[PDB]
Amino acid sequence: GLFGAIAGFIEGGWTGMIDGWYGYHHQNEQGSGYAADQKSTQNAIDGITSKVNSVIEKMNTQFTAVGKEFNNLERRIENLNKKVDDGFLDVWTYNAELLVLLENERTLDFHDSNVRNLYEKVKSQLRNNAKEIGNGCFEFYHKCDDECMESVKNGTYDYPKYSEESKLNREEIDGVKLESMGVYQILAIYSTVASSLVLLVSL
Amino acid sequence: GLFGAIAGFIEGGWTGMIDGWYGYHHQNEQGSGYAADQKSTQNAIDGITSKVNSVIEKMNTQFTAVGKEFNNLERRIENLNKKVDDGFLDVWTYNAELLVLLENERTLDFHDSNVRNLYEKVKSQLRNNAKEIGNGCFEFYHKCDDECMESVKNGTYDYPKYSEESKLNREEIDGVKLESMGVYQILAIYSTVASSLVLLVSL
Amino acid sequence: GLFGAIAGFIEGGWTGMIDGWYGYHHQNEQGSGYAADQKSTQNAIDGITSKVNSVIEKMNTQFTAVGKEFNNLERRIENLNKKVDDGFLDVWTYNAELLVLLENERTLDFHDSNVRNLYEKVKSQLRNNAKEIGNGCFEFYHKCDDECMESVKNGTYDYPKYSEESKLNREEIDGVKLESMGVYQILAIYSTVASSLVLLVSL
Amino acid sequence: EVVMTQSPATLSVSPGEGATLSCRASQSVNTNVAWYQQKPGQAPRLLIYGASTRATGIPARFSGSGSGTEFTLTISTLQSEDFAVYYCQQYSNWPPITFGQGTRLEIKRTVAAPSVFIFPPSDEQLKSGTASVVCLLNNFYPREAKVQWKVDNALQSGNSQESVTEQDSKDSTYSLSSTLTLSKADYEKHKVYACEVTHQGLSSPVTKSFNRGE
Amino acid sequence: DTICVGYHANNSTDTVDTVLEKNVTVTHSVNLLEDSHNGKLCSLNGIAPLQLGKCNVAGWLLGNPECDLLLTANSWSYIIETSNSENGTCYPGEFIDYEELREQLSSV
Amino acid sequence: EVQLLESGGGLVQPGGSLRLSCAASGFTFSSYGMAWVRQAPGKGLEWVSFISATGLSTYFADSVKGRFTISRDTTKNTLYLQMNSLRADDTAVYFCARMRRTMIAFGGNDFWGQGTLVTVSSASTKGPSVFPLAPSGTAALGCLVKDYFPEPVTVSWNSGALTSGVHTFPAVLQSSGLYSLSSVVTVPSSSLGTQTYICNVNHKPSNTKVDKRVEP
Ligand SMILES: *[C@@H]1O[C@H](CO)[C@@H](O[C@@H]2O[C@H](CO)[C@@H](O[C@@H]3O[C@H](CO)[C@@H](O)[C@H](O[C@H]4O[C@H](CO)[C@@H](O)[C@H](O)[C@@H]4O)[C@@H]3O)[C@H](O)[C@H]2NC(C)=O)[C@H](O)[C@H]1NC(C)=O
Ligand SMILES: *[C@@H]1O[C@H](CO)[C@@H](O[C@@H]2O[C@H](CO)[C@@H](O[C@@H]3O[C@H](CO)[C@@H](O)[C@H](O)[C@@H]3O)[C@H](O)[C@H]2NC(C)=O)[C@H](O)[C@H]1NC(C)=O
Ligand SMILES: *[C@@H]1O[C@H](CO)[C@@H](O[C@@H]2O[C@H](CO)[C@@H](O[C@@H]3O[C@H](CO)[C@@H](O)[C@H](O)[C@@H]3O)[C@H](O)[C@H]2NC(C)=O)[C@H](O)[C@H]1NC(C)=O
Ligand SMILES: *[C@@H]1O[C@H](CO)[C@@H](O[C@@H]2O[C@H](CO)[C@@H](O[C@@H]3O[C@H](CO)[C@@H](O)[C@H](O)[C@@H]3O)[C@H](O)[C@H]2NC(C)=O)[C@H](O)[C@H]1NC(C)=O
Ligand SMILES: *[C@@H]1O[C@H](CO[C@@H]2O[C@@H](C)[C@@H](O)[C@@H](O)[C@@H]2O)[C@@H](O[C@@H]2O[C@H](CO)[C@@H](O)[C@H](O)[C@H]2NC(C)=O)[C@H](O)[C@H]1NC(C)=O
Ligand SMILES: *[C@@H]1O[C@H](CO)[C@@H](O[C@@H]2O[C@H](CO)[C@@H](O)[C@H](O)[C@H]2NC(C)=O)[C@H](O)[C@H]1NC(C)=O
Fold first, then answer.
1. Torsion region of B6: left, alpha or beta (phi above 0 gives left; psi -120 to 50 gives alpha)
2. Disulfide bonds, which pairs (chain E) (predicted)?
3. Do D104 and D8 have their domain in common?
């Protein structure tokens, strides 16, 4: 089953990333990104390697097999021999092609699940101060440097260090401050006017 | 694996929808819905058609096979012949039944993944102005006509056309306006009262 | 495909839970939790039982088979007999090992899908008044007793009973009330001052 | 910080021909290079992005190539309007964003000799206290010329400025002015002043001189 | 500042067949099928084969006099007949149980 | 149709402050990042600053940190840049510009403004001075324009009836803080006797026309 990530809500892959299959792309105060994630791709490599080695070691090697001989009065046994050899040959080639054709969707859905889980982790440990925008990116209500980049990448974000300050910038963005505009609707008028009653009586 | 959509958080299917497997149901200012989504069901049809054609073309057709004859002194070869035929027959019927019994959950989980991905797309391009309610529906803080219905359906929603106006209606719903109630707690009292000190001195 | 729940965003299992595979853990006013969910584990038990019974009943039992005899002038038929028996033996042991090695990831991903769907249900019927915290827990802006615990567990939460009162406690937590602090920025100063103009004129 | 470098400094070309320019980097950007041209007194306009895909509304005689650290812009033909200033830009690693150094494009014609003149200061400049001498060159190709300023056959430094016109549409040759600006005392001190011109079209360095009071 | 999440891409053009699709371009792959072979006939574990040449096994065991060359051989790895191995029995007759003799021969 | 209009220029005393504004028309201003690039006179380009699409990310060049701020208004579709405590080396022509995409690798800038002139220097508005460049016995004659602080001037020759061999050199800043240029005319060598040549200099900031006839 297509889990939705590869060629889904995430666009196609990255040419510039080299040393892995799963990486990040940061844009802090002093650089750009393209750094790998050596945890999850290691488990991916180990799983696929165990997979291929198992598929190799299940198929047994065959020993010597030589075609036999018959005279003109043993045609029946020869036809039986040909039926045996062709039947076993058809069974083995059917098993091989069917094994490959199931294993391919198995490994492609495995990669798709890896992408989606690595995305859900990054979203789940950035539960408010992120502002997702589309196709797997985040935009960071607070300020972040390389230290908190690697703090995201090792999964140790220590979120309540930033939680109030991020909140401040979030209240800048939409807020109720545009509804407020700085003063009250017009009450400061009435209090200029409650000072005007003073002037009019104390003339 | 049951991905959760069919007979899950979404209730059962729709009788009135005709021309597809995946559709929408809109209720704009001038009509009701039941329109299909010809993109995703086309890929579904093509995938299942390639699947069935592959399963057909892997099985080879068999040529002529006629039962043979033996006298009373060749019982050994005849028992060998019967063992050969029954063994191949059992292997072929086992492979056929096992192939069908795996292919059925493959295609059912394929349909389940299609439902869940088509739901995640509609949610992801309606990231604020939607107000989901349950069993795969949305309720649209702004106003929408047939043009923005097809703008949802082609996946081109151009969200920042509506983003402030939707926000206005969202601030109507819960807001802080019910906490505000129109004036201040009682400060307008003190400013009536700061006008009352005027009256009492300037008597 | 690893759906992400078991040994993923949820930590390892619970020793103290006994009578099922899928349960809850509540901490209301008068107790702790560890109660099972007899709906979903029943479907899990029935599915796995049908699975194992199908795998049993597909394999046929074999009847009597006795090794045969040959003299020194029928070596050809004997070599054919040995090739037949070893070929069928290799095909059957290959099918058995491959069947088990696919069925194991099938059932493990089945359990993973069950965990993730049971989590999504509890989140989806607690759409605001929950405050998720991490590794599959919720923290309940309103007050709940054992009755609403079983109301969650049977899936009948009747949410709009609590919706305003929960909102009250949510406005306690972050709010705009800390920005408000109790009075206005300094306007009450001007209205003390608009009462001070009274004093200065009416001296 | 990826520092870019354009090459060459200035390209000369005859019309109906091609051109090629190289932009190099300090590290390896992948393909993320764009180019721009700019008419004098105008905003720059987009040409090519990613070194392969031409922008919308661009004629097909432009092309680009390159990867790694070196990139190349190529113009097939000309119609005497593309002579502008050219800029390469990376966008791989930023902030900050770094541009090239600017590369103009010249029209090539026959190497011609300047007409050289000199102008002594008017005496109302000495009434104001100004001493302004103008050494003037007109109608010369190429751009390079050498002016040596001599005070009784002795070189000065830091008292002469210069101004160069643009490329005329008729002859494609240039015009140069050099200005000596001094006080009264040095002009009334020495007598024989000269500007000596070493130009590629000239056979010899030509000396234009004048006396004090002429 | 942000952290976009993505995956590897490459320039490889090799295609893998699958159930729901034909010709899926993959980044890395591995072959599991052999096609290359020499045109040579070498020895099994360092023991040379026995080439009969133009001789049949019957003419070799009987000692067909035109099979005079391979008179001194005693050991091999396997026996090579050719498409011109027609020098068997010079005098006409019937070598009875030739096939069973070949089957007994193939384990010595 | 997409264009960018920009304003806020003018001569300002050093150490002062400016508020440049770039308005946009023809597209959705709330769906793209924006950037500022300056150009020194007679030099190449120089990127100044960047603001993201939602405005959550702001970036500045390293040489100009702490002296410049930037903001945007959605309803006005307007970009504002505040300059504080300027220096003499920041006289340039400024450009507001739009990114082409919204990724990190944005892929160039497709739309631009048209440049506002900002001069940061400490001087007063001064009218120029005109001096003749008289032929000794030669075939050329000119006029020198000196000591005017704001650009530009305009030098005509007998009310524009003389367009051959009339070279007007571009101006140059002198070290005292004023501008100077010259205009030269090539004549025949026997034309010194009869033909009349008058250069006319017009300075629009100080609003002064000077008429000057050149003669040996
Ligand atoms: C080892 O193998 C070789 C290869 O087969 C074999 O030599 C062949 O022997 C046969 C048998 O004699 C030859 O066949 C005949 O050759 C003669 C020439 O001598 C032809 O005239 C024959 O034509 C017909 O006429 C004959 C006279 O009536 C008949 O006797 C005959 O049956 C035909 O009807 C016929 O071609 C064959 O030519 C050779 N070939 C070669 C190229 O060697 C050799 O005999 C084998 N060794 C031993 C010891 O048997
Ligand atoms: C995962 O990433 C986090 C990011 O916070 C790592 O923690 C940081 O590790 C670095 C390692 O160099 C520490 O930097 C240096 O530490 C030394 C020793 O105190 C000090 O002399 C330096 O000045 C510098 O700080 C850093 O202190 C540390 N902590 C923080 C908050 O940045 C973490 O090690 C990574 N790995 C794991 C397994 O978590
Ligand atoms: C996907 O849906 C969008 C919905 O916005 C489609 O865009 C709209 O397409 C219709 C096609 O009829 C356009 O309607 C008509 O256009 C003509 C030509 O301008 C005009 O004369 C009519 O008055 C009417 O507007 C419509 O303009 C267009 N845009 C919008 C904003 O509605 C889109 O074509 C669909 N397909 C794809 C591949 O995106
Ligand atoms: C799923 O859980 C809900 C939880 O609300 C169950 O509803 C509650 O069921 C209990 C069963 O004992 C009811 O408790 C008792 O009802 C009797 C009869 O009215 C009364 O005499 C007692 O005082 C006590 O209330 C309870 O009323 C009922 N409702 C609520 C709101 O708690 C529900 O039955 C469970 N099962 C299903 C299939 O929904
Ligand atoms: C799948 O591909 C094979 C090989 O085709 C080549 O590689 C493909 C990725 C694509 O680039 C093709 O254009 C290439 O030719 C196809 O097999 C060939 O198909 C063509 C017609 O498409 C036919 O003329 C040939 O005889 C076939 N075989 C080869 C090896 O030449 C196959 O058809 C492709 N199938 C689909 C559905 O695309
Ligand atoms: C895909 O790109 C890679 C670059 O990583 C190409 O590999 C290069 O191939 C040439 C030709 O032999 C070598 O000289 C280089 O050393 C290789 N690069 C590296 C990093 O090893 C590869 O050839 C490209 N694919 C195709 C089909 O051309």
1. beta
2. 55-67
3. yes
Q: Are D94 and D117 in a shared domain?
A: no
Q: Which helix (H) or strand (E) holds F212?
A: strand F208-213
* Gap between the terminal Cα atoms of chain C: 86
Residue D30 sits at the chain A interface (C-beta within 8 Å) = yes
What one-character-per-residue DSSP string does F20-51 give? EEEEEESS-GGGS-EEEEEE-TTS-EEEEEEE
Burial class (CB in 10 A: 0-12, 13-18, 19+), C20: middle
Q: Tell me how many helices (H) and strands (E) chain A has.
A: 6, 2
Rounded CA-CA distance C23/D185 in Å is: 104
d(CA B48, CA B103) in angstroms, rounded, equals 11
Answer whether F210's CB lies under 8 Å from F134's CB: no
Q: What is the distance between the terminal CA atoms of chain F, rounded to a whole angstrom? A: 58
Of the partner residues D34, D44, D210, the one whose CB lies closest to the CB of residue F107: D34
| Closest residue in chain C to residue A55, using alpha carbons only | C98
Strands (DSSP E) along chain D, which ranges?
A: 4-7, 10-13, 19-25, 33-38, 45-49, 53-54, 62-67, 70-75, 85-90, 103-107, 115-119, 131-140, 145-151, 160-164, 174-182, 193-199, 206-210
Last residue of a domain, one of D109, D137, D167: D109
Same domain, D80 and D115: no
Other Cβ atoms within 10 Å of B175 Cβ, number: 12
Q: Let me know the angle formed at the C-alpha of E99 by E93 and E100, rounded to the nearest 5 degrees.
A: 115
Q: What is the resolution of this structure in A?
A: 4.1
B185 burial level (CB within 10 Å; 0-12, 13-18, 19+): exposed
Contact: A194, B194; criterion CB under 8 Å: yes
Please give the helix or strand (H or E) that residue C105 lies within, else none: helix C75-124
CA proximity to B84, closest of C59, E103, C65, A75: C65
Q: Sign of the C-alpha dihedral, residues E86, E88, E93, E97?
A: negative
Helices B75-124 and B40-58 pack at an angle, to 10 degrees, of 170
- Break-preceding residues in chain E (C–N over 2.5 Å): none
What phi and psi, each to the nearest 5 degrees, are found at residue A191? Answer: -85, -30
Ligand 4 environment, Cβ below 6 A = C 147, 150-151, 154, 156
Under a CB-based contact definition with an 8 Å cutoff, are residues D211 and D121 in contact? no
Q: Point out which residues pair with F81 in neighbouring strands.
A: F20, F70
| Domain finish residue from D76, D109, D142 | D109
Handedness of CA B126, B135, C46, C13 (dihedral sign): positive
D141 and D192, same domain (yes or no): yes
Distance of alpha carbon D64 from alpha carbon D55, whole angstroms: 12
Q: How was this model experimentally determined? A: cryo-EM
Instruction: Describe the crossing of helices C75-124 and C40-58 by its angle, rounded to 10 degrees.
Output: 170
| Lining residues, ligand 5, CB within 6 Å | E 15, 22-23
- For residue D152, what is the domain's CATH number? 2.60.40.10
Cα–Cα distances in Å, from E104 out to A68, C75, C78, E49, E100? 12, 8, 12, 18, 6
Residue A170's contacts (CB-CB under 8 Å, 6 or more residues apart) are A128, A129, A141
The token pair at F158 is 């007998």
In this complex, the chains that touch F, judged by 3 or more CB pairs closer than 8 A, are: A, B, D, E
What are E49's two structure tokens?
């084969």
Mutation for A interface: B77, B83, B88, B193, most A CBs within 10 A: B88
